[PDB]
Amino acid sequence: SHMCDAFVGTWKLVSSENFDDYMKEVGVGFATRKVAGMAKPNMIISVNGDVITIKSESTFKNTEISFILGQEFDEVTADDRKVKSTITLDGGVLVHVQKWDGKSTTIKRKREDDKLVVECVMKGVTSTRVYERA
Numbered sequence: 001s002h003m004c005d006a007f008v009g010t011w012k013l014v015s016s017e018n019f020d021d022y023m024k025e026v027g028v029g030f031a032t033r034k035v036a037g038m039a040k041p042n043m044i045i046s047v048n049g050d051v052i053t054i055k056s057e058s059t060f061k062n063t064e065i066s067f068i069l070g071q072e073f074d075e076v077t078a079d080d081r082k083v084k085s086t087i088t089l090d091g092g093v094l095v096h097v098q099k100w101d102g103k104s105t106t107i108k109r110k111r112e113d114d115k116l117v118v119e120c121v122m123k124g125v126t127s128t129r130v131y132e133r134a
């Protein structure tokens with residue numbers, strides 16, 4: 001047993017707050033905000049050795065990343081940014097930093113009760129996205 005066992009599984013979005021304002025802060029355009037904001041993604045997290053895989057499946061886009069903690073990688077996001085990402089574990093929280101065009105956003109993922117809580121921050125603006133087991 002290991003590092004991220006409590007994150008492993010299949011999760012479904014059950015609530016979102018302030019995601020439009022977060023997307024505006026990130027620079028997402030109108031049409032993508034409207035369509036992406038409707039989505040109710042499935043997030044599938046798995047671990048094989050040191051490699052963590054996070055898939056997001058939705059009517060808008062299917063994305064997948066695989067990574068080793070602390071080791072930077074290339075990521076094309078669902079809103080089509082080309083970013084440099086680093087994911088670390090900090091006190092039981094998965095901390096995902098995305099860098100592009102001199103900008104930065106941080107996505108934190110933690111277990112709280114039976115939920116997996118996703119907090120997305122872009123400057124002063126936070127969005128909170130709550131997932132439960134599928």
Ligand SMILES: Cc1ccc(S[C@H](CCCCSc2ccc(Cl)cc2)C(=O)O)cc1
Pocket residue numbers: 023026028032033036037039041056058060061077078079107118120129
């Ligand atoms: C449609 C859809 C697909 C995937 C997600 S991942 C997100 C966390 C990661 C957020 C930062 S990357 C990003 C993704 C989409 C947009 Cl619009 C803007 C930024 C989460 O809900 O858990 C959200 C919405």
